[PDB]
Amino acid sequence: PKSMQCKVILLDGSEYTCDVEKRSRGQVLFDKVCEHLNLLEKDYFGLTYRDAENQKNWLDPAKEIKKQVRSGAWHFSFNVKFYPPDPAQLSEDITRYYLCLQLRDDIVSGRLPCSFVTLALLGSYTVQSELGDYDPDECGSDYISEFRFAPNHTKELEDKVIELHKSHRGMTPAEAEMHFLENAKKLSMYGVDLHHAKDSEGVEIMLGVCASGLLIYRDRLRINRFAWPKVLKISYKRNNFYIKIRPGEFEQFESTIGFKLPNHRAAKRLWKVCVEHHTFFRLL
Ligand SMILES: O=C(c1c(F)cccc1F)N1CCCC1
Numbered sequence: 001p002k003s004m005q006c007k008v009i010l011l012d013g014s015e016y017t018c019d020v021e022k023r024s025r026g027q028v029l030f031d032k033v034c035e036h037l038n039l040l041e042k043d044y045f046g047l048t049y050r051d052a053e054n055q056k057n058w059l060d061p062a063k064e065i066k067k068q069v070r071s072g073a074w075h076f077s078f079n080v081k082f083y084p085p086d087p088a089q090l091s092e093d094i095t096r097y098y099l100c101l102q103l104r105d106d107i108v109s110g111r112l113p114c115s116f117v118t119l120a121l122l123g124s125y126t127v128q129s130e131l132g133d134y135d136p137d138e139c140g141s142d143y144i145s146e147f148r149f150a151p152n153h154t155k156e157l158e159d160k161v162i163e164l165h166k167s168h169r170g171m172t173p174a175e176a177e178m179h180f181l182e183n184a185k186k187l188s189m190y191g192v193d194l195h196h197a198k199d200s201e202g203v204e205i206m207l208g209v210c211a212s213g214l215l216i217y218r219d220r221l222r223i224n225r226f227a228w229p230k231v232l233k234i235s236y237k238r239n240n241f242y243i244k245i246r247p248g249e250f251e252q253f254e255s256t257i258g259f260k261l262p263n264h265r266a267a268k269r270l271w272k273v274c275v276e277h278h279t280f281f282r283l284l
């Protein structure tokens with residue numbers, strides 16, 4: 001039996017290495033990673049890899065790893081795939097913990113925009129969870145934390161983190177993580193996977209895929225929202241991605257909205273993530 005070495009970037013930034021038989025399906029590797037992480041609530045998570053364009057793709061657990069990664073290194077990242085709309089309802093604290101680590105990267109990367117105050121409050125719960133109670137000995141007026149809190153750090157943000165940290169005395173890691181999640185879950189881009197596309201008139205838009213449905217971000221004025229119940233059908237033809245919407249209260253027939261993606265692969269990627277998210281909605 002010939003086995004390929006796999007390297008997986010974990011959400012703390014560390015690297016897990018293991019081997020799987022070269023014709024292994026993605027589920028085999030994913031099961032090894034989740035056992036390493038002591039993670040039972042595995043359905044919210046998945047593995048990604050980067051193609052020769054360094055675009056992120058979901059490893060399909062049902063298909064051979066080799067057929068997916070094709071010519072690339074067997075190098076993967078462990079990630080949240082389906083962001084729970086109510087993290088309080090997860091059965092395990094360790095699940096909430098990995099969700100926190102993913103959200104911390106969502107914030108630092110700018111995928112999850114956040115007000116100054118929310119950056120500081122989230123940062124304060126992270127510090128409380130990671131270091132425990134506020135200690136003045138480690139923090140002077142000049143203090144800068146090792147923790148990355150934001151896409152751009154300022155001394156003002158570091159000060160606000162410390163001020164809110166002082167208020168969390170006695171909070172345990174699981175409690176601080178639950179508070180982190182209660183705040184993060186409310187942010188407008190929480191759990192939203194964004195895809196570049198053009199509308200039928202060729203105007204640049206963004207399509208967001210999340211638990212609740214599909215978002216079309218046309219401009220700061222006019223964000224189209226299609227709850228899953230409203231989406232009849234989704235399709236991809238060549239580079240074209242089409243959404244069919246149930247008849248409105250004044251339509252007799254469904255409406256078809258068409259989008260142009262960069263290439264055929266980007267259309268197929270968007271279709272698959274939409275199908276997978278809709279099934280998630282169906283089981284909520
Ligand atoms: O076209 C759809 C679909 C969707 F993805 C969202 C809502 C309604 C639908 F018919 N599917 C194709 C594969 C299974 C789901």
Ligand SMILES: O=C(c1c(F)cccc1F)N1CCCC1
Binds near residue numbers: 043044276277279281
């Ligand atoms: O069974 C699924 C699921 C999956 F296993 C693959 C793709 C889409 C899904 F909804 N889930 C249960 C809880 C979270 C997702």
